[PDB]
Design an enzyme around this catalytic site. Structure first.
Site, PDB file in Angstrom:
ATOM      1  N   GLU A  14       1.822 -44.355   8.827  1.00  0.00           N
ATOM      2  CA  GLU A  14       1.520 -43.065   8.211  1.00  0.00           C
ATOM      3  C   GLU A  14       2.563 -42.652   7.173  1.00  0.00           C
ATOM      4  N   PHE A  26      -2.706 -34.481  25.572  1.00  0.00           N
ATOM      5  CA  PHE A  26      -2.566 -35.858  25.115  1.00  0.00           C
ATOM      6  C   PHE A  26      -2.472 -35.930  23.595  1.00  0.00           C
ATOM      7  N   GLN A  27      -1.375 -36.510  23.115  1.00  0.00           N
ATOM      8  CA  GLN A  27      -1.107 -36.649  21.686  1.00  0.00           C
ATOM      9  C   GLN A  27      -1.129 -35.308  20.959  1.00  0.00           C
ATOM     10  N   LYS A  55     -10.137 -31.090  16.849  1.00  0.00           N
ATOM     11  CA  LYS A  55     -11.232 -32.048  16.978  1.00  0.00           C
ATOM     12  C   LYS A  55     -12.592 -31.397  17.223  1.00  0.00           C
ATOM     13  N   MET A  94      25.098 -48.170  -1.996  1.00  0.00           N
ATOM     14  CA  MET A  94      25.611 -46.838  -2.302  1.00  0.00           C
ATOM     15  C   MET A  94      26.651 -46.377  -1.286  1.00  0.00           C
TER      16      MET A  94
HETATM   17  C1  LIG Z   1      21.490 -41.386  -4.900  1.00  0.00           C
HETATM   18  C2  LIG Z   1      21.055 -40.232  -5.828  1.00  0.00           C
HETATM   19  C3  LIG Z   1      21.855 -39.871  -6.919  1.00  0.00           C
HETATM   20  C4  LIG Z   1      21.456 -38.822  -7.764  1.00  0.00           C
HETATM   21  N1  LIG Z   1      22.242 -38.480  -8.828  1.00  0.00           N
HETATM   22  C5  LIG Z   1      21.671 -37.726  -9.848  1.00  0.00           C
HETATM   23  C6  LIG Z   1      22.308 -37.640 -11.222  1.00  0.00           C
HETATM   24  O1  LIG Z   1      23.345 -38.242 -11.445  1.00  0.00           O
HETATM   25  N2  LIG Z   1      21.723 -36.882 -12.219  1.00  0.00           N
HETATM   26  C7  LIG Z   1      20.551 -36.200 -11.969  1.00  0.00           C
HETATM   27  O2  LIG Z   1      20.036 -35.535 -12.848  1.00  0.00           O
HETATM   28  N3  LIG Z   1      19.935 -36.265 -10.685  1.00  0.00           N
HETATM   29  C8  LIG Z   1      20.500 -37.036  -9.617  1.00  0.00           C
HETATM   30  N4  LIG Z   1      19.893 -37.098  -8.371  1.00  0.00           N
HETATM   31  C9  LIG Z   1      18.663 -36.416  -8.183  1.00  0.00           C
HETATM   32  C10 LIG Z   1      18.904 -34.930  -7.802  1.00  0.00           C
HETATM   33  O3  LIG Z   1      19.230 -34.862  -6.423  1.00  0.00           O
HETATM   34  C11 LIG Z   1      17.620 -34.052  -8.060  1.00  0.00           C
HETATM   35  O4  LIG Z   1      16.529 -34.719  -7.598  1.00  0.00           O
HETATM   36  C12 LIG Z   1      17.430 -33.737  -9.523  1.00  0.00           C
HETATM   37  O5  LIG Z   1      18.689 -33.699 -10.197  1.00  0.00           O
HETATM   38  C13 LIG Z   1      16.770 -32.394  -9.669  1.00  0.00           C
HETATM   39  O6  LIG Z   1      15.775 -32.475 -10.661  1.00  0.00           O
HETATM   40  P1  LIG Z   1      15.510 -31.188 -11.595  1.00  0.00           P
HETATM   41  O7  LIG Z   1      16.837 -30.457 -11.849  1.00  0.00           O
HETATM   42  O8  LIG Z   1      14.919 -31.656 -12.922  1.00  0.00           O
HETATM   43  O9  LIG Z   1      14.510 -30.195 -10.907  1.00  0.00           O
HETATM   44  P2  LIG Z   1      13.225 -30.619 -10.126  1.00  0.00           P
HETATM   45  O10 LIG Z   1      13.585 -31.048  -8.722  1.00  0.00           O
HETATM   46  O11 LIG Z   1      12.538 -31.777 -10.858  1.00  0.00           O
HETATM   47  O12 LIG Z   1      12.216 -29.357 -10.054  1.00  0.00           O
HETATM   48  C14 LIG Z   1      11.530 -28.938 -11.261  1.00  0.00           C
HETATM   49  C15 LIG Z   1      12.017 -27.535 -11.615  1.00  0.00           C
HETATM   50  O13 LIG Z   1      11.303 -27.027 -12.747  1.00  0.00           O
HETATM   51  C16 LIG Z   1      10.417 -25.974 -12.290  1.00  0.00           C
HETATM   52  N5  LIG Z   1       9.134 -26.196 -12.827  1.00  0.00           N
HETATM   53  C17 LIG Z   1       8.184 -26.978 -12.335  1.00  0.00           C
HETATM   54  N6  LIG Z   1       7.112 -26.934 -13.136  1.00  0.00           N
HETATM   55  C18 LIG Z   1       7.381 -26.099 -14.187  1.00  0.00           C
HETATM   56  C19 LIG Z   1       6.686 -25.639 -15.346  1.00  0.00           C
HETATM   57  N7  LIG Z   1       5.390 -26.070 -15.604  1.00  0.00           N
HETATM   58  N8  LIG Z   1       7.298 -24.781 -16.191  1.00  0.00           N
HETATM   59  C20 LIG Z   1       8.520 -24.370 -15.952  1.00  0.00           C
HETATM   60  N9  LIG Z   1       9.216 -24.771 -14.880  1.00  0.00           N
HETATM   61  C21 LIG Z   1       8.680 -25.626 -13.989  1.00  0.00           C
HETATM   62  C22 LIG Z   1      10.425 -26.018 -10.824  1.00  0.00           C
HETATM   63  O14 LIG Z   1      10.313 -24.690 -10.285  1.00  0.00           O
HETATM   64  C23 LIG Z   1      11.743 -26.586 -10.500  1.00  0.00           C
HETATM   65  O15 LIG Z   1      12.736 -25.554 -10.497  1.00  0.00           O
HETATM   66  C24 LIG Z   1      20.266 -38.130  -7.524  1.00  0.00           C
HETATM   67  C25 LIG Z   1      19.463 -38.497  -6.421  1.00  0.00           C
HETATM   68  C26 LIG Z   1      19.860 -39.544  -5.580  1.00  0.00           C
HETATM   69  C27 LIG Z   1      18.991 -39.948  -4.383  1.00  0.00           C
HETATM   70  C1  LIG Z   2      -3.944 -44.765  25.433  1.00  0.00           C
HETATM   71  C2  LIG Z   2      -3.405 -44.004  26.662  1.00  0.00           C
HETATM   72  C3  LIG Z   2      -4.180 -43.911  27.824  1.00  0.00           C
HETATM   73  C4  LIG Z   2      -3.686 -43.219  28.943  1.00  0.00           C
HETATM   74  N1  LIG Z   2      -4.449 -43.138  30.074  1.00  0.00           N
HETATM   75  C5  LIG Z   2      -3.818 -42.798  31.266  1.00  0.00           C
HETATM   76  C6  LIG Z   2      -4.465 -43.068  32.611  1.00  0.00           C
HETATM   77  O1  LIG Z   2      -5.563 -43.596  32.656  1.00  0.00           O
HETATM   78  N2  LIG Z   2      -3.819 -42.719  33.782  1.00  0.00           N
HETATM   79  C7  LIG Z   2      -2.577 -42.123  33.733  1.00  0.00           C
HETATM   80  O2  LIG Z   2      -2.009 -41.817  34.765  1.00  0.00           O
HETATM   81  N3  LIG Z   2      -1.950 -41.857  32.481  1.00  0.00           N
HETATM   82  C8  LIG Z   2      -2.577 -42.199  31.238  1.00  0.00           C
HETATM   83  N4  LIG Z   2      -1.958 -41.941  30.022  1.00  0.00           N
HETATM   84  C9  LIG Z   2      -0.660 -41.369  30.032  1.00  0.00           C
HETATM   85  C10 LIG Z   2      -0.735 -39.821  30.128  1.00  0.00           C
HETATM   86  O3  LIG Z   2      -1.028 -39.300  28.842  1.00  0.00           O
HETATM   87  C11 LIG Z   2       0.631 -39.206  30.620  1.00  0.00           C
HETATM   88  O4  LIG Z   2       1.653 -39.812  29.959  1.00  0.00           O
HETATM   89  C12 LIG Z   2       0.829 -39.376  32.107  1.00  0.00           C
HETATM   90  O5  LIG Z   2      -0.431 -39.413  32.780  1.00  0.00           O
HETATM   91  C13 LIG Z   2       1.626 -38.221  32.645  1.00  0.00           C
HETATM   92  O6  LIG Z   2       2.590 -38.708  33.548  1.00  0.00           O
HETATM   93  P1  LIG Z   2       2.975 -37.804  34.826  1.00  0.00           P
HETATM   94  O7  LIG Z   2       1.729 -37.048  35.314  1.00  0.00           O
HETATM   95  O8  LIG Z   2       3.490 -38.716  35.936  1.00  0.00           O
HETATM   96  O9  LIG Z   2       4.086 -36.761  34.459  1.00  0.00           O
HETATM   97  P2  LIG Z   2       5.332 -37.059  33.564  1.00  0.00           P
HETATM   98  O10 LIG Z   2       4.951 -36.997  32.103  1.00  0.00           O
HETATM   99  O11 LIG Z   2       5.878 -38.452  33.895  1.00  0.00           O
HETATM  100  O12 LIG Z   2       6.470 -35.951  33.865  1.00  0.00           O
HETATM  101  C14 LIG Z   2       7.176 -35.997  35.130  1.00  0.00           C
HETATM  102  C15 LIG Z   2       6.835 -34.726  35.906  1.00  0.00           C
HETATM  103  O13 LIG Z   2       7.581 -34.668  37.126  1.00  0.00           O
HETATM  104  C16 LIG Z   2       8.581 -33.626  36.999  1.00  0.00           C
HETATM  105  N5  LIG Z   2       9.824 -34.137  37.421  1.00  0.00           N
HETATM  106  C17 LIG Z   2      10.694 -34.828  36.697  1.00  0.00           C
HETATM  107  N6  LIG Z   2      11.751 -35.146  37.454  1.00  0.00           N
HETATM  108  C18 LIG Z   2      11.555 -34.649  38.716  1.00  0.00           C
HETATM  109  C19 LIG Z   2      12.275 -34.643  39.947  1.00  0.00           C
HETATM  110  N7  LIG Z   2      13.513 -35.268  40.040  1.00  0.00           N
HETATM  111  N8  LIG Z   2      11.744 -34.025  41.025  1.00  0.00           N
HETATM  112  C20 LIG Z   2      10.577 -33.433  40.944  1.00  0.00           C
HETATM  113  N9  LIG Z   2       9.860 -33.410  39.812  1.00  0.00           N
HETATM  114  C21 LIG Z   2      10.317 -34.002  38.693  1.00  0.00           C
HETATM  115  C22 LIG Z   2       8.594 -33.219  35.590  1.00  0.00           C
HETATM  116  O14 LIG Z   2       8.856 -31.810  35.482  1.00  0.00           O
HETATM  117  C23 LIG Z   2       7.228 -33.516  35.130  1.00  0.00           C
HETATM  118  O15 LIG Z   2       6.351 -32.434  35.460  1.00  0.00           O
HETATM  119  C24 LIG Z   2      -2.425 -42.618  28.907  1.00  0.00           C
HETATM  120  C25 LIG Z   2      -1.647 -42.714  27.730  1.00  0.00           C
HETATM  121  C26 LIG Z   2      -2.140 -43.404  26.617  1.00  0.00           C
HETATM  122  C27 LIG Z   2      -1.299 -43.513  25.339  1.00  0.00           C
END
Ligand SMILES: Cc1cc2nc3c(=O)[nH]c(=O)nc-3n(C[C@H](O)[C@H](O)[C@H](O)COP(=O)(O)OP(=O)(O)OC[C@H]3O[C@@H](n4cnc5c(N)ncnc54)[C@H](O)[C@@H]3O)c2cc1C
Ligand SMILES: Cc1cc2nc3c(=O)[nH]c(=O)nc-3n(C[C@H](O)[C@H](O)[C@H](O)COP(=O)(O)OP(=O)(O)OC[C@H]3O[C@@H](n4cnc5c(N)ncnc54)[C@H](O)[C@@H]3O)c2cc1C
Ligand SMILES: Cc1ncc(Cn2c(C)c(CCOP(=O)(O)OP(=O)(O)O)sc2=O)c(N)n1
Ligand SMILES: Cc1ncc(Cn2c(C)c(CCOP(=O)(O)OP(=O)(O)O)sc2=O)c(N)n1
Ligand SMILES: Cc1ncc(Cn2c(C)c(CCOP(=O)(O)OP(=O)(O)O)sc2=O)c(N)n1
Ligand SMILES: COC(=O)c1csc(C)c1S(=O)(=O)NC(=O)n1nc(OC)n(C)c1=O
Ligand SMILES: COC(=O)c1csc(C)c1S(=O)(=O)NC(=O)n1nc(OC)n(C)c1=O
Ligand SMILES: [K+]
Ligand SMILES: [Mg+2]
Ligand SMILES: [Mg+2]
Ligand SMILES: [Mg+2]
Lengths: 582, 582, 287
Positions: B59, B121-122, B171, B485
């Site tokens: 992602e 979950f998630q 969802k 760097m």
């Molecule tokens: C390793 C490293 C080294 C770096 N060293 C340098 C360096 O030596 N020199 C350097 O320049 N940078 C350097 N940077 C990058 C720096 O951190 C900034 O990303 C950069 O300097 C900022 O860009 P900017 O001032 O043009 O503003 P930007 O971040 O590009 O933002 C644009 C600005 O213009 C405004 N704006 C946007 N659209 C409009 C519009 N249509 N009309 C009017 N205003 C608008 C926005 O509000 C904003 O304030 C470095 C980055 C890294 C990772």
């Molecule tokens: C693709 C997928 C499928 C899944 N399907 C399943 C499934 O089929 N079956 C399944 O079981 N899980 C499944 N899960 C996992 C599920 O989402 C949870 O992670 C899991 O079920 C929860 O574990 P738990 O109930 O044991 O509690 P936990 O998440 O393990 O938390 C521990 C609990 O016990 C408590 N606790 C901690 N320490 C102590 C202690 N010393 N004394 C007393 N209490 C304590 C904590 O407060 C907490 O409430 C799946 C996950 C994925 C990613």
């Protein structure tokens, strides 16, 4: 007695103070990726002879490694990142640790204090961003707060319900000279006043009473039991109550045992879900009644008196309302109940043999199953062979998807912390880095990443980490050329209409793409590919026997479906037992 | 007149409504990675014949691609992700777009509405997480709000100061049937009342007056001028005022032109920084006075009357206080000033030839330079050769680090939107995905990713995307086996003490690690490696002439330093012109 | 309307808050800093180059002084009824413009600002941005504690005054010489005025008296004062007003003067909200 590298009256950089603070917490390993705002910390790390850094190739790899380190050891995982893009790359791991309750301390460098809020170079308000996805976080605003905050962060991360804590450290603080005070008092009066007391006798006696009055009891164990394997095992001996485990609780009770109902829930065994469905007493120890397990809450354990023991009061009564509850350490509760169950052992006549017989009938009629087609490799069979050849003693990390479920179903974990898997957030790309962390924490252990081709490639760059660090990480890649889990849902709910689930190359759709072997070769990691089921056993053996890292590309038919399946929000009557995508 | 695939009275899924909403915005391309909470949207995408999806392998690759798409076209970039781990993987890209003001619409699937807040979950509270790193975001709580919110999101992302907008879609909303109303009115009364009016004559006349009264004027142009290349060019013809550009403004004025002072700032040219230092009139058009450019603010343009034209009122007077300001579109301001500068052209006697002569002396005495050692390849020279062979017409994306600065220094961009680079956040791993987005937006263009071995491997998985989508992306990999760097800062400020900056394998420190050629081969992408400077020209030619994707591994000595350099927070007198790490 | 405000002027804005510079109106020239220091610097230049510059805006001042003659502040006198404007003008004369004045919020507030000529800053204490009623009496308390020897007068309305009337107790117990000039129109005047001009004089809960005795003054503010041992009086005829205010001032300690006014009075002139200079209302009331 701790020995510092500095004199008690010798001023040193805040960065040196931060590292010594880690040393005083017993930290031996960190996962840190250098950047401008954290250079000082990295310099301070080289001066330490007790803390070793494992350089990842991506900060997400870093934080996932810290998770694997934590999950496989019970110690807190520590990851360090620079400001801005470094910090934001940690986010998925922070959310992951919070949802699965994994002890984690994340340290991020920050721009100088005066620059904060000015949209400065590589500045991100990471405290604001991560407030809702960490257990707690900090912004250090003075060098003298470093010892206190670090101590508080480790305390909060590892006590109660464990979780991730983030500490944001401005660069000027890192550079400031000071004399640290290590005898500071933590400022957590609220948190400490709400820390659960040890379980009272009256509560424990009520549970033992309910057990003697039941005829169909079921144990429902999860992540909270990971430190209570001995206590839980003793409990089972005294009661004879069958055990159903969550995805997060696998191994708390030995999976190869006779009283093991294995996993319950959406992809749980038919007999595990049956047991809960028809139970009259549900012992919920260390679980959180997640919907993957319960389905429709009104149907979940509808005939059972529910006992819930959790260390988090907010979890007790959240989804399912218990009849009896205990807010505290399940380890202590188990110890107390064991003492009673043994002293009153013959006064009680505990014998649920009739109930166990009923379940064992369900286990014979509806066991875990897979089908074998020609010489094609069943992923289930592959994992089952790995179990045999590693004697069930391997540490197993996974990605997320079909292979994850099969890894949980067809491997019998003997002890807790063998099973490392993203459950609550379910983040792909977790497997490989987690295996890295596990191998560092457990150098002598067999570590195997059971991964899918989608999840594996997401953090494939960590293959470099593995070779450079010379870690004996084994990769069992189950390759179905698809995002299997999503593909499965397409088959059952969208008439098998493919929507961007194929991962290969449509110009050469029969060729395996990408060539994962060459990914490994790029990082000097020996690898092979197996396609015929007949050659599978020897191939896995070779992977294990070959010293160091290894990648085994296991080609599987993609038509396979994870079974059985209870549809989301469904009941036990809605369980799907047959069918695939052929 | 728009043609819908549904009847005006025909109820359709919210997901179908969301996709049609994109179609009505003129969207042709999205970057979407499927997951459970967004499956409905992905299904709806397949029913669309006008919107094409580019499936990334991560992602973060997806959102960075959307950025490249946007930066290279001026159109909004659109990325779609599932809930939880999908959403959190977007975060670095959102922050990136906000800091560099890139128009972006991010859509994330979410758990059902009733499940929100239950740690489902998630589930991730992504609106809460991303509120401080997006221009604005939404949580859709009803299917009937979809047309309005989508319209508002595109309007907010592309108008005023452009930026990222995130829309979170539950969802159950995606699955709900409804009849959309497209004639809804946007609810943005505050934002629209504060939209800058077209520049008044009195303000413009004041600027033209200051110009005629100056003797050492300097143009200071940035990202805000990317749509004003024609207007700015006309302005320069009428005034003869030399042009200094920011990292973000490269190409707004042609770099190969006589009046181009090239880039100013930390790694800007000596003569650009000189001009600003000794100017008496500073024309700041579309810039934000960032510290990379200014250094110590009290020393920056200390002798100049400052004119600042920005479309964001919050930027005017934030760091440096202007004498004259205009809050509005710099394009319109330039048009107005051009009309006056031409009608009063001979009444005014604009001739800064004496000032231009003074600067041209500095350009001769302190030009951009690099040293050549034996047959080793100077990265500067490599980029200079690419310029010659592509005739300066190539689209160039980069990672972050030394190679990034050299890519900006030694390539002469003729037009804006040739230069795609992470400036404000400075996120590694940006180069390859951004090139993907650029190539999709510009199919007939030469697209080249000038990357470093650290940045490249971070999102190396997107090589698969490139092959599958058959994009002619060229990769010019500058390989110094280090995080250059950071390594440079170690040399100048930490006595060259290495703290985890080496990226190779310490067991074989003279071998190139990893083997990037095999990364490409894994994805069926033709590749080669060049080490001798004598073979470099032919190798780059081969990369260009070979149809389709190509990886060129250019081996460079790591001892090279980016020059010149003004230390952070320093002045013009503190500029470093000589030295490296040998 | 911002687009009409100073549409012909080059605008110079000096503010110590950078966030204020360019927020609503865009200046041509700006200075972010202390206006005190800016004034000092400009004074030094304006004096050294005093004769080099030939500053003379007498023609412009003449043009304005013509407008001042044709459109001055005005009020009408009806019989023996007391004009609130006149009451404040008399207070100005008798205190020689040296009094500290706190107010409530409403019509009386505007009249207090219009018809009293403040010689120095920090004589005028009034809620402007939030415009909170009940501010007058307590603010006068604070002012009197800070300035024990000063003449402190709370020019209040019957709505605003009663909101924090309990602080009368504070005044007596602390023996503060707070004077209360209560302008009593038996209404929430400002709201009542807007009803007249924009809602056809339709009364919506703006009358503060007792509908069972609508001609009786309610409440009796004199008894509020008497409860707290604060001497008080009521004046109704314009002829007795001057002597009554004098008595309030000459009487040592706290004092309440209940000044009865016709409620039909409107604050003038008035530019409607969001309007321009051409929309200014100069005549009319609620009779
Ligand atoms: C390793 C490293 C080294 C770096 N060293 C340098 C360096 O030596 N020199 C350097 O320049 N940078 C350097 N940077 C990058 C720096 O951190 C900034 O990303 C950069 O300097 C900022 O860009 P900017 O001032 O043009 O503003 P930007 O971040 O590009 O933002 C644009 C600005 O213009 C405004 N704006 C946007 N659209 C409009 C519009 N249509 N009309 C009017 N205003 C608008 C926005 O509000 C904003 O304030 C470095 C980055 C890294 C990772
Ligand atoms: C693709 C997928 C499928 C899944 N399907 C399943 C499934 O089929 N079956 C399944 O079981 N899980 C499944 N899960 C996992 C599920 O989402 C949870 O992670 C899991 O079920 C929860 O574990 P738990 O109930 O044991 O509690 P936990 O998440 O393990 O938390 C521990 C609990 O016990 C408590 N606790 C901690 N320490 C102590 C202690 N010393 N004394 C007393 N209490 C304590 C904590 O407060 C907490 O409430 C799946 C996950 C994925 C990613
Ligand atoms: C980062 C991320 N994106 C998307 C998802 C959603 N998702 C996706 C896309 C899955 C398929 C994973 O494919 P795989 O090859 O890694 O494993 P399987 O083929 O065995 O399912 S599983 C699943 O829940 C996710 N969990 N994490
Ligand atoms: C995700 C991330 N992590 C860390 C940094 C900090 N950082 C790092 C580690 C740089 C070195 C990049 O190495 P490279 O090989 O990609 O390029 P060079 O060797 O030419 O510097 S540059 C820089 O500012 C960053 N910008 N982004
Ligand atoms: C606590 C509060 N409530 C309501 C208002 C609104 N409001 C009200 C109700 C005013 C009339 C105040 O009546 P008054 O007797 O105190 O003064 P006047 O009769 O001279 O207007 S003025 C005005 O703006 C307010 N400013 N403060
Ligand atoms: C990393 O970003 C920062 O820490 C930063 C933001 S604002 C500001 C004054 C600083 S810094 O203290 O002076 N370090 C720095 O600029 N840089 N710049 C770098 O490369 C361009 N590096 C490596 C820094 O430390
Ligand atoms: C993806 O997560 C969700 O959307 C989700 C959280 S809670 C809840 C009731 C749902 S869902 O509407 O019923 N979809 C779903 O569970 N799943 N589960 C899946 O794999 C296990 N997939 C692909 C879903 O859509
Ligand atoms: K990656
Ligand atoms: Mg797969
Ligand atoms: Mg490098
Ligand atoms: Mg009144």
């Amino acid at each position: 007695t701790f020995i510092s590298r500095f004199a008690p009256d010798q001023p040193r950089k805040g960065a040196d103070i931060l590292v010594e603070a880690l040393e005083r917490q017993g930290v031996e390993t960190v996962f840190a990726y250098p950047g401008g705002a954290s250079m000082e910390i990295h310099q301070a790390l080289t001066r330490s002879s007790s803390i070793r850094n494992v350089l990842p190739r991506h900060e997400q790899g870093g934080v996932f490694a810290a998770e694997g380190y934590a999950r496989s050891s019970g110690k807190p995982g520590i990851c360090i990142a620079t400001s801005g893009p470094g910090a934001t790359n940690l986010v998925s791991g922070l959310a992951d640790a919070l949802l699965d309750s994994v002890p984690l301390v994340a340290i991020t460098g920050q721009v100088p204090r005066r620059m904060i809020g000015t949209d400065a170079f590589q500045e991100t308000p990471i405290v604001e961003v991560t407030r809702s996805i960490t257990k707690h976080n900090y912004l250090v605003m003075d060098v003298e707060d470093i010892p206190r905050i670090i101590e508080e962060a480790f305390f909060l991360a590892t006590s109660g319900r464990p979780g991730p804590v983030l500490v944001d450290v401005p660069k000027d603080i890192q550079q400031q000279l000071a004399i640290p005070n290590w005898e500071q008092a933590m400022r957590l009066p609220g948190y400490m006043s709400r820390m659960p007391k040890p379980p009272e006798d009256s509560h424990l006696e009520q549970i033992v009473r309910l057990i003697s009055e039941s005829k169909k009891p079921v144990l429902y164990v999860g992540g909270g039991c990971l430190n209570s394997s001995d206590e839980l095992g003793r409990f089972v001996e005294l009661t004879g109550i069958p055990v159903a485990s969550t995805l997060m609780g696998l191994g708390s009770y030995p999976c190869d045992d006779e009283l093991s109902l294995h996993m319950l829930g959406m992809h749980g065994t038919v007999y595990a879900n049956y047991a809960v469905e028809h139970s009259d007493l549900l012992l919920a120890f260390g679980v959180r009644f997640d919907d993957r397990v319960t389905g429709k809450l009104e149907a979940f354990a509808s005939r059972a008196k529910i006992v819930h023991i959790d260390i988090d009061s907010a979890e007790i009564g959240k989804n399912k309302t218990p009849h009896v509850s205990v807010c505290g350490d399940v380890k202590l509760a188990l110890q107390g109940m064991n003492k009673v169950l043994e002293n009153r052992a013959e006064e009680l006549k505990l014998d649920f043999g009739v109930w166990r017989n009923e379940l064992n009938v369900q286990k014979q009629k509806f066991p875990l199953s897979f089908k074998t087609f020609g010489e094609a490799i069943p992923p289930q069979y592959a994992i089952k062979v790995l179990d045999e050849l590693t004697d069930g003693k391997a540490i197993i990390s996974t990605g997320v998807g079909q292979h994850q479920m099969w890894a949980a179903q067809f491997y019998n974990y003997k002890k807790p912390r063998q099973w490392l898997s993203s459950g609550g957030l379910g983040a792909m790309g977790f497997g490989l880095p987690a295996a890295i962390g596990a191998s560092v924490a457990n150098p002598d252990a067999i570590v195997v990443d059971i991964d899918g081709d989608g999840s594996f490639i997401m953090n494939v760059q960590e293959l470099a980490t593995i070779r450079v660090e010379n870690l004996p990480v084994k990769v069992l890649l189950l390759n179905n050329q698809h995002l299997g889990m999503v593909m499965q849902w397409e088959d059952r709910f969208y008439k098998a209409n493919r929507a961007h689930t194929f991962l290969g190359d449509p110009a050469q759709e029969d060729e395996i793409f990408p060539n994962m072997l060459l990914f490994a070769a790029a990082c000097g990691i020996p690898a092979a590919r197996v396609t015929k089921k007949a050659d599978l056993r020897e191939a896995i053996q070779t992977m294990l026997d070959t010293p160091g890292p290894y990648l085994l590309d296991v080609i599987c038919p993609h038509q396979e479906h994870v079974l059985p399946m209870i549809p989301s929000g469904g009941t036990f009557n809605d369980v799907i037992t047959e069918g695939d995508g052929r």
